[PDB]
Design a protein around this ligand. Structure first.
Ligand code: CGS
Ligand code: CA
Ligand code: CA
Ligand code: CA
Ligand code: ZN
Ligand code: ZN
Length: 166
């Protein structure tokens, strides 16, 4: 059972921009770009949404790696516990995705997988809440799965399209 964030916030545009505010030292700069790019694509593939990376200017979605208290009244808790959090569509912090820098970000499973976490986070950026369906990416539980073969569950697609269709 997919859920939509309270209020049902959605982007009213299809051309959405994102920008990587900073890079975690755990991964190689380009692996980070790859992870996020691929994470956005997971959602582009099933909706009329198009995501474009920018390096300067104000992006709709800001991606940032932060530790503890980082200026949004949603403090991280050190390694473990909270992995990341994002905000529903809207201007300002809206759509932004934060990743706890106290976690160890990896391209695979050596620690916390950026890509997978990012897919789940971007789901929030777009207006999706937590799903009760345990096999949905929007399920509140982190669980590493093969990345090279990853695929959105029927629940996720059904939920994301109930907001933007396709
Ligand atoms: C697959 O991607 C994931 C990304 C982050 C997480 S998370 O464990 O950090 N988490 C979910 C959660 C689980 C259990 C209890 N409370 C909260 C945060 C969440 O939902 N972030 O988006 C929550 C504390 C705000 C889990 C999975
Ligand atoms: Ca943490
Ligand atoms: Ca924003
Ligand atoms: Ca780290
Ligand atoms: Zn934050
Ligand atoms: Zn979540």
């Amino acid at each position: 059972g997919f859920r939509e964030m309270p209020g049902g916030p959605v982007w009213r545009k299809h051309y959405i921009t994102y920008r990587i505010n900073n890079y975690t030292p755990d991964m190689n700069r380009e692996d980070v770009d790859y992870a996020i790019r691929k994470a956005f694509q997971v959602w582009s593939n099933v909706t009329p949404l198009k995501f474009s990376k920018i390096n300067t200017g104000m992006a709709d979605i800001l991606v940032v790696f932060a530790r503890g208290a980082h200026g949004d009244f949603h403090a991280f808790d050190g390694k473990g516990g909270i992995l990341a959090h994002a905000f529903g569509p809207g201007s300002g912090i809206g759509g932004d995705a934060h990743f706890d820098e106290d976690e160890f970000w990896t391209t695979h499973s050596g620690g916390t997988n950026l890509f997978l976490t990012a897919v789940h986070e971007i789901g929030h950026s777009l207006g999706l809440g937590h799903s009760s369906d345990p096999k949905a990416v929007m399920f509140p539980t982190y669980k590493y799965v093969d990345i090279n073969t990853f695929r959105l569950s029927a629940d996720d697609i059904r939920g994301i399209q109930s907001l933007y269709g396709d």
